[PDB]
């Protein structure tokens, strides 16, 4: 089994850092915000070996048929915000709207991810993110790409959401 996962969210939330921690087992202090790539990782989740194909979205917005088609290939989406950036949390609505549009569905596998959980400067309350996740009917996971907190849990939770949706 192979799962196409797409990491989305505003600039600077840690999409690349999360992806590179997952794939390469190290934290990036800076990562060019124009670099977009897909990465593969073999994992075992609930006793089943699977291949994750992870798209780390980057660059500028693009509302073309080709870009929509590419994003539509995603089976599940990580909605990433940073816990020290309220605007990034505000932006989650936009990302969800675009996913709902291209997937033409209200039941797309998604996980809300509050990244940078290692930092002291929190501006988004855990309870606020949990309330919105509850309203959306999706899991919420706090992560740190720096320390590895929650990283596997975020991606593996998303896989579990996909498995439930496709079986
Ligand atoms: C700092 C650079 C960065 O990481 N950025 C800035 C620009 N970004 C976007 O504006 C962006 C928004 C967005 F909603 C999507 C997107 C999500 C889901 C989806 F189904 C579709 S279809 C479609 N077309 C787009 C677009 N555009 C989306 C994406 Cl893919 C964005 O661009 C990626 C970078 C993102 C964060
Ligand atoms: N302390 C801390 N910094 C992080 C974390 N995730 C990302 N960063 C930093 O935040 C900045 C933006 O990360 P990046 O992955 O480029 O964000 P992207 O634009 O969403 O791809 C970089 O300086 C990263 O080192 C995290 O969990 N903790
Ligand atoms: Mg990036």
In CATH, the homologous superfamily goes by the name P-loop containing nucleotide triphosphate hydrolases
Overall body shape: globular
Strand order of the largest sheet: 2-3-1-4-5-6
Say which molecules are bound, naming each kind only once: Olomorasib Bound Form, guanosine-5'-diphosphate, magnesium ion
Structural class per helix/strand content?
A: alpha/beta
Proportion of residues in helical segments: 25-40%
Q: Please compute the radius of gyration using only Cα atoms.
A: 15 Å
Strand content: 15-25%
Order of helices and strands: EHEEHEHHEHEH
The CATH topology label is: Rossmann fold
Number of domains: 1
Biggest sheet, in brief?
Answer: 6 strands, mixed
Query: Quick one: how many beta strands?
Result: 6
Number of helices: 6
User: Given this structure, which CATH class is correct?
Assistant: Alpha Beta
- Corresponding CATH architecture: 3-Layer(aba) Sandwich
How far is the N terminus from the C terminus?
A: 12 Å
């Amino acid at each position: 089994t192979e799962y196409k996962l797409v990491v989305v969210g505003a600039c600077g939330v840690g999409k690349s850092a999360l992806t590179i921690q997952l794939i390469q087992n190290h934290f990036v202090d800076e990562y060019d915000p124009t670099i977009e790539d897909s990465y593969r990782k073999q994992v075992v989740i609930d006793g089943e070996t699977s291949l994750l194909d992870i798209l780390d979205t980057a660059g500028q917005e693009e509302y073309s048929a080709m870009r929509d088609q590419y994003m539509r290939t995603g089976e599940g989406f990580l909605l990433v915000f940073a816990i020290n950036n309220t605007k990034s949390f505000e932006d989650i609505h936009h990302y969800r709207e675009q996913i709902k549009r291209v997937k033409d569905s209200e039941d797309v596998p998604m996980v809300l991810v509050g990244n940078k959980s290692d930092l002291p400067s929190r501006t988004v309350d855990t309870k606020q993110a949990q309330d919105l996740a509850r309203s959306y009917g999706i899991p919420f996971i706090e992560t740190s790409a720096k320390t590895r907190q929650g990283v596997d849990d975020a991606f593996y939770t998303l896989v579990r959401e996909i498995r439930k949706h496709k079986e």
